[PDB]
Design a binder for this molecule. Structure first.
Ligand SMILES: [Mg+2]
Ligand SMILES: [Mg+2]
Ligand SMILES: [Mg+2]
Ligand SMILES: [Zn+2]
Lengths: 161, 196, 134, 52, 205, 190
RNA sequence: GACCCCAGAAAAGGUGUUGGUUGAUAUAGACAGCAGGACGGUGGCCAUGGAAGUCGGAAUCCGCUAAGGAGUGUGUAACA
């Protein structure tokens, strides 16, 4: 997340110094992950995701829907913290107990990605199967048999195309 | 020239003791020369401050022991980075002006930070090119009003630990008031008396 | 905050210069002066130092007001066209006047020494008008 | 992307050193004489050059 | 184009000066023998340092030129162009010969003049530098550096004389005061107490 | 020049007992026991008092070379005392530009595997000297801890790891990857 | 390393050790270490595209001082 933050900041300061001001004819031009103007993923394996996609499936977990996903993208990214145990968000880096909280970006976007990345690349068969069922990712023949990095490629292709 | 310089110090210390009956022994902290120049200009009207080798002072006082007794009380007190200041004005005013004129010392790298500093969330006013220092400390920042804007409060350095070069130069660019200190009175000598 | 942070200095002198100096590049500090501001900056700066003229400015958001600190080489070369003990004596009053002194005699000693750029013997045997300055 | 703190540590063992002008031996940064017999323990030393 | 100096290092022949018998000698490599402020007065430069030789050997005129330049460069760098006066006290008066082999063999073996060297005896002075009293370390360093252009072993001495004169420095000042010495350029003239009294009258007046 | 007598004394803490078998020093403390024989040096080791517990190293008629072996022994014994009271702990930081260095601590800390040093498939298996235990910090991301009673053993093991991660055929001023000894400390910090 | 002729070595080096010469500092607190300060006129003058102590030519002073060179090196385009 820090590395993603550095790239976002470096791009933003480039367009701020050389480009026009916020009151220019173009308007505000800076990139914001909360705004959905910057995405992630890898083109070699054919999978990419945006903050919009995760907020779509987490509002689904929870016009009207358009407002819901738009306001939720704010809590998806940034220096906001989420306790897994409490189940509620928090603006405080330390919980009342004293437990260190993970930031919401890593806790519910990067966390499923790291779980599936570790599961396939470490050949944990039952972990991969349960994750696919829970995340309703659909696979087909000639793809369900494979294991390893090609299986990793196929999963995120069908999860975050 | 070292012989004449030492002798000139001896006649300097001996005539100042004869001239002034009341003195403060004061310990110089990690205070710059500019801080000392400020002190001397501040006190130029009424007081005169002198510093030097502690072993030099003890020898000169011991030589003057016979002519001026009761000065032996200062002998077991010239220890550490301390010096003299010669005064004729009232103690409480001299002490009060001394504890009031403290320069805002900047953050010097590699030193102990006795004052805990925290940076609030405000627009720094620095252009969007000094962000290299902010990213060096990992401080997430955004550019608002065409200038660097810190998102939230950050604690930078705690008490009793070494400061780094990156932390020091971030404080120098932010121009916030770091740990600052001046000379502090060890003891007081009033015509043969010792107090705090 | 004086409506602006414009206490930044300048090191131009002699000819007008205007854009040929570092004024256009240092102009975006306030962003108001530009060509008119630095031209009327040199308007009052042509005299009171034709040397490098280390100066300072205060911006009226459209115009500028210039203050010229008394640099030693500046005032010595500007007052020049020998001893001229009278003119140096009368000039040690309006300067920055601190010089970590204790007596105003010391200031004229220091600038009588800085004007050596020999005029050191006057400081060497100085015995006249020592406390005339303050 | 080494942090500045770790760049200092690795340079303590790789870059901050003295070099004999006669036998290129890698000596500690405070050396005044080379430690090696083949050069006769000469005092002709130069700093190891940097990459800057 | 020249043989190594090891082939002419030792005084093996009788002195062979350039004369009406030895004709066709090329000019010596060294032509200048005094440098620095040669016109300095005697009392200006009281300190005189020498490069004394330890070996009875031959110094080539090429070595004298190289060592004179070497000492001059360091003395200029440390004392300024007008802070010193040097004097090479060896002149290359001995002609060395070469028997060129491309009548072949040793038939008619007598050689032709190749160059000039100066024969130096043990204890003889090769180079002298006079300067102010504070420049002693620069004189010692300059003479030490010039030692590397010479074959044998040389020692660096700091003479007890005043400058280039033959009178001891601790007695030079009051000797001049009592009029036994009168300066003339870089040296002094010794005035004995015998002669016409008219010269004694020219002094003291 | 043969100096008549060069002597140096080391003070032993109360919780330590030093026993001498000739020039063999046996130092026993809370952390265990250390043994080291100085038979390669001709010195007179003796124990002086009861409540102060001094150990005196004498050297009679020594020249310059073997006068330098008096402080050497005294410092070795002081390291032995330090080891059996506080122990030696060498922290090592692994530094890398692109490829993270993966360290796996095998049985009892005796074996250390460096996998991805400069991203190469070779696996460096470094064995610690006996009595030295290696560990991976939970307080830092890339940090080893080498703990043991003997400074000679611990620092030698640390040097084995450091010289294991040595770059070849490249510019070492540019390629700074490897594991280096960061700080030399103790345990119990007392 | 090891004995006239004689059967192999030089200049130049060495913080290896031994002896000697000369000089200097020191309980008015040497030296070496660790720990502070290292200022103001002043970014001194002339140099130029920038030379602020540190590319260069010259100057080489002053007050404050316990001390601080208009500068021993590193470093910046110059600063820092
Ligand atoms: Mg012959
Ligand atoms: Mg030690
Ligand atoms: Mg290569
Ligand atoms: Zn070597």
């Amino acid at each position: 997340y820090q590395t993603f933050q550095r790239i976002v900041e470096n791009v933003n300061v480039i367009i701020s110094t050389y480009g026009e001001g916020e009151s220019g004819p173009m308007g505000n031009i800076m990139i914001d992950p909360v705004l959905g103007t910057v995405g992630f993923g890898s083109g070699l394996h054919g999978w990419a995701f945006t903050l919009k996609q995760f907020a779509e499936m987490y509002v689904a977990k929870f016009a009207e829907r358009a407002k819901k996903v738009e306001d939720m993208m704010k809590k998806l990214w940034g220096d906001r913290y989420f306790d897994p145990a409490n189940g509620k968000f928090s603006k405080s880096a330390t919980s009342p107990e004293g437990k260190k909280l993970p930031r919401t970006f890593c806790q519910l976007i990067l966390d499923p990605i790291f779980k599936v990345f570790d599961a396939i690349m470490n050949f944990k068969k039952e972990e991969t199967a349960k994750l696919i069922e829970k995340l309703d990712i659909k696979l087909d023949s000639e793809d369900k048999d494979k294991e390893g990095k090609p299986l990793l490629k196929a999963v995120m292709r069908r999860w975050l195309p | 020239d070292r012989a004449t310089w030492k002798s000139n110090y001896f006649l300097k210390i001996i005539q100042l003791l004869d001239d002034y009956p009341k003195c403060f022994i004061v310990g110089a902290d990690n205070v710059g020369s500019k801080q000392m120049q400020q002190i001397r200009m501040s006190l130029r009207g009424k007081a005169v401050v002198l510093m030097g080798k502690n072993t030099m002072m003890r020898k000169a006082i011991r030589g003057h022991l016979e002519n001026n007794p009761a000065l032996e009380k200062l002998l077991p007190h010239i220890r550490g980075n301390v010096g003299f200041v010669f005064t004729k004005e009232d103690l409480t005013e001299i002490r009060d002006m001394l504890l009031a004129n403290k320069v805002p010392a900047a953050a010097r790298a590699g030193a102990i930070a006795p004052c805990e500093v925290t940076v609030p969330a405000q627009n720094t006013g620095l252009g969007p090119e000094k962000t290299s220092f902010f990213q060096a400390l990992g401080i997430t920042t955004k550019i608002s009003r065409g200038t660097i804007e810190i998102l939230s409060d950050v604690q930078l350095i705690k008490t009793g630990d070494k400061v780094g070069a990156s932390e020091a130069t971030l404080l120098n660019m932010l121009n916030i008031s770091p740990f600052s200190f001046g000379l502090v009175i060890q003891q007081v000598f009033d015509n043969g008396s010792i107090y705090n | 905050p004086n409506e602006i942070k414009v206490v930044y200095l300048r090191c131009t002198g002699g000819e007008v210069g205007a854009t040929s100096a570092l004024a256009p590049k240092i102009g975006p500090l306030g962003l108001s002066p530009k060509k008119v501001g630095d031209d009327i900056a040199k308007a009052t700066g042509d005299w009171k130092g034709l040397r490098i003229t280390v100066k300072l400015t205060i911006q009226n958001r459209q115009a500028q007001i210039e203050v010229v600190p008394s640099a030693s080489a500046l005032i010595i070369k500007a007052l020049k066209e020998i001893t001229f003990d009278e003119i140096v004596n009368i000039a040690r009053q309006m300067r920055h006047r601190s010089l970590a002194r204790e007596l105003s005699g010391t200031i004229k000693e220091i600038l009588g020494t800085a004007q050596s750029v020999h005029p050191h013997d006057i400081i060497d045997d100085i015995n006249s008008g020592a406390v005339e300055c303050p | 992307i080494i942090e500045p703190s770790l760049r200092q540590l690795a340079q303590k063992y790789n870059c901050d050193k003295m070099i004999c002008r006669k036998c290129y031996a890698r000596l500690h940064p405070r050396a005044v004489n080379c430690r090696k017999k083949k050069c006769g323990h000469t005092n002709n030393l130069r700093p190891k050059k940097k990459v800057k | 184009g020249r043989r190594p100096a090891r082939c002419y290092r030792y005084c093996k022949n009788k002195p062979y000066p350039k004369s009406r018998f030895c004709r066709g000698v090329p000019d010596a490599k060294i032509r200048i023998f005094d440098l620095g402020r040669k016109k300095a007065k005697v009392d200006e430069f009281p300190l005189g340092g020498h490069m004394v030789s330890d070996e009875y050997e031959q110094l080539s005129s090429e070595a004298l030129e190289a060592a004179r330049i070497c000492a001059n460069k360091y003395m200029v760098k440390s004392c300024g162009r007008d802070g010193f006066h040097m004097r090479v006290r060896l002149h290359p008066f001995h002609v060395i010969r070469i028997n060129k082999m491309l009548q072949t063999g040793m038939r008619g073996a007598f050689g032709k003049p190749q160059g000039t060297v100066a024969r130096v005896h043990i204890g003889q002075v090769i180079m002298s530098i006079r300067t102010k009293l504070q420049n002693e370390e620069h004189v010692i360093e300059a003479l030490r550096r010039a030692k590397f252009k010479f074959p044998g072993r040389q020692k660096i001495h700091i003479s007890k004389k005043w400058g280039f004169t033959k009178f001891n420095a601790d007695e030079f000042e009051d000797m001049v005061a009592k009029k036994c010495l009168i300066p003339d350029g870089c040296g002094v003239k010794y005035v004995p107490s015998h002669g016409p009294l008219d010269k004694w009258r020219v002094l003291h007046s | 020049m043969k100096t008549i007598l060069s002597n140096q004394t080391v003070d032993i803490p109360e919780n330590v007992d030093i026993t001498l078998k000739g020039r063999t020093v046996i130092v026993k403390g809370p952390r265990g026991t250390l043994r080291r024989d100085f038979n390669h040096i001709n010195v007179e080791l003796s124990l002086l008092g009861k409540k102060k517990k001094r150990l005196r190293v004498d050297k009679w008629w020594g020249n310059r070379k073997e006068l330098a072996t008096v402080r050497t022994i005294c410092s070795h014994v002081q390291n032995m005392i330090k080891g059996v009271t506080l122990g030696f702990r060498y922290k090592m930081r692994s530094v890398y530009a692109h490829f993270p260095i993966n360290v796996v601590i095998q049985e009892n800390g005796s074996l250390v595997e460096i996998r991805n040093f400069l991203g190469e498939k070779y696996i460096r298996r470094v064995r610690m000297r006996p009595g030295v235990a290696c560990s991976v910090s939970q307080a830092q991301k890339d940090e080893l801890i080498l703990e043991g009673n003997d400074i000679e053993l611990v620092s030698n093991s640390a040097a084995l790891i450091q010289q294991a991660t040595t770059v070849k055929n490249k510019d070492i001023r540019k390629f700074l990857d490897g594991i280096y000894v960061s700080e030399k400390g103790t345990v119990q910090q007392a």
